[PDB]
Amino acid sequence: MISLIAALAVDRVIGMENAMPWNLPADLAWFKRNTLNKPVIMGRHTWESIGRPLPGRKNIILSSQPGTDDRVTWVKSVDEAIAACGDVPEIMVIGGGRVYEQFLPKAQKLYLTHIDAEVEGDTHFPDYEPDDWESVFSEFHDADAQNSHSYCFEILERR
Numbered sequence: 156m157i158s159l160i161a162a163l164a165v166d167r168v169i170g171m172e173n174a175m176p177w178n179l180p181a182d183l184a185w186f187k188r189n190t191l192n193k194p195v196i197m198g199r200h201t202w203e204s205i206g207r208p209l210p211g212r213k214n215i216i217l218s219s220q221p222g223t224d225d226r227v228t229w230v231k232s233v234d235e236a237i238a239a240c241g242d243v244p245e246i247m248v249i250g251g252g253r254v255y256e257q258f259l260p261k262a263q264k265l266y267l268t269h270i271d272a273e274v275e276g277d278t279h280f281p282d283y284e285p286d287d288w289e290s291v292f293s294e295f296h297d298a299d300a301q302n303s304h305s306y307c308f309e310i311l312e313r314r
């Protein structure tokens with residue numbers, strides 16, 4: 156009902172310098188499939204990192220300050236972000252670190268890509284209690300010519 160989606164390297168690293176230290180087209184395709192036609196909520200830094208709207212999704216940006224682009228919807232608290240989604244089945248929270256930790260307790264579902272990459276970064280996915288979560292889907296993929304690490308797509312349900 157609220158879901159988080161994220162891609163985690165070793166030690167739960169999710170970013171460095173406001174970009175993601177890997178480039179895996181197969182994972183971005185997974186992200187697009189699981190977010191298409193659903194509202195996405197992101198923090199202002201992630202909005203900057205992405206650099207443009209995500210098409211085919213209502214884009215909701217969290218910021219304390221006035222917004223700077225009317226192609227997306229701007230909100231000033233977690234409460235307001237959820238409301239702005241409108242009355243839907245599934246809201247997708249798309250990060251970054253600070254936003255994930257605030258939505259985690261409200262979330263029923265995690266879509267996590269576990270990437271076998273050793274990255275030196277400055278942003279992490281939450282240190283979540285694993286006992287809270289049932290793994291209901293896993294798909295491991297070897298690296299290939301397009302994807303320069305192995306990666307595993309998991310979906311976790313809150314127990």
Ligand SMILES: NC(=O)c1ccc[n+]([C@@H]2O[C@H](COP(=O)([O-])OP(=O)(O)OC[C@H]3O[C@@H](n4cnc5c(N)ncnc54)[C@H](OP(=O)(O)O)[C@H]3O)[C@@H](O)[C@H]2O)c1
Binds near residue numbers: 198202220231
């Ligand atoms: N690996 C992945 O899947 C993934 C996914 C997403 C992002 N990332 C990475 O994560 C990094 C960005 O994460 P962190 O630094 O993300 O920033 P963030 O969580 O994207 O953005 C944080 C900002 O959002 C606003 N915000 C957050 N909570 C708010 C609240 N309750 N009320 C009002 N404003 C709120 C604030 O903006 P103001 O300062 O304007 O108030 C603020 O904290 C980047 O490196 C990005 O590449 C990785």
Ligand SMILES: Nc1nc(=O)c2nc(CNc3ccc(C(=O)N[C@@H](CCC(=O)O)C(=O)O)cc3)cnc2[nH]1
Binds near residue numbers: 182186204
């Ligand atoms: N699993 C997962 N992987 C990610 O890379 C990811 N990235 C973010 C934040 N950053 C981004 C950055 C770019 C795009 C992006 O360009 N996505 C396209 C896919 C098109 C393609 O295949 O290149 C999209 O339309 O979603 C999405 C999120 C949030 N959650 C994630 N979750």
